[PDB]
Amino acid sequence: AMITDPMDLLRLFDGVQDSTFSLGTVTEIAQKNLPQYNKQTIKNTIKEYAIRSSGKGDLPRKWVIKDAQNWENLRANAN
């Protein structure tokens, strides 16, 4: 079960991208902006579309939305 509404995904991506936090924390922050969804749905959605860079730098360890093409498509529809 995942977030499915484009506008909601756009809100999720914006707060996930470049975040330096744990999954539990990024999830809880997101649930405040998206109060209708449960944590497991938000986690599922983050683990589907995002990835946590290991730095390995020196590093900030951060969240990246993987498919920049997709993010672009559904950023186009809303506008």
UniProtKB/Swiss-Prot annotation:
Stretches that traverse the bilayer: none
Subcellular location: Nucleus
Function: Acts as a component of the histone chaperone complex chromatin assembly factor 1 (CAF-1), which assembles histone octamers onto DNA during replication and repair. CAF-1 performs the first step of the nucleosome assembly process, bringing newly synthesized histones H3 and H4 to replicating DNA; histones H2A/H2B can bind to this chromatin precursor subsequent to DNA replication to complete the histone octamer. Plays a role in the maintenance of heterochromatin.
Subunit structure: Component of chromatin assembly factor 1 (CAF-1), composed of MSI1/p50, CAC2/p60 and RLF2/CAC1/p90. Interacts with SAS2.
Annotated family: Belongs to the RLF2 family.
Misc note: Present with 1590 molecules/cell in log phase SD medium.
Gene: RLF2
Protein name: Chromatin assembly factor 1 subunit A
Parent-record interval covered: 522 to 600 of 606
